[model samples]
Target: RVQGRWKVRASFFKGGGGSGFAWNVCVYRNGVRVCHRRAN
Candidate 1:
């Protein structure tokens, strides 16, 4: 559970032809982590 404010940068990009790129960055409680997985 999150008890603080958070900022998320969700984006999707094309990585070549059919392959696509999907990534996100999350900032919560002054912490930064990759958004490939859910924040527990």
Candidate 2:
């Protein structure tokens, strides 16, 4: 699910449109935050 949380992964990104290739992700918790990591 998009709202998924916990030790599971929740991520956001856009690709395949030739936009310079960037991606980001996070591991979530009820601690509820923007824990994020990004790559290109």
Candidate 3:
């Protein structure tokens, strides 16, 4: 589980989408899911 401050990792256009078009973001703490969000 996480201990310190949280962190975020993000990916864009996983399914052949253009840059600045979409993104898949995930939040983690000690390698656990905190929350999720999306953009387009």
Residue-level lDDT for 3 in candidate 3: 48
| Candidate 3 weakest lDDT stretch, 10 residues | 4-13
Candidates 1 and 2 compared: the better one by lDDT is 2
RMSD per prediction, one decimal?
13.0, 10.9, 12.9
Show where candidate 2 strays beyond 4 Å: 1-17, 20-28
Candidate 1, residue 16: the lDDT equals 39
TM-score of each: 0.17, 0.19, 0.22
Report the lDDT tens digits of candidate 3 across residue range 1-40.
Answer: 5443354223333454554532446678899976555543
Residue 20: error of model 2 in Å? 5.8
**lDDT of candidate 2 vs native?**
0.51
The reply for model 1, stretches above 4 Å from the true place, is 1-15, 23-30, 33-40
- What's the C-alpha lDDT at position 16 in model 2? 45
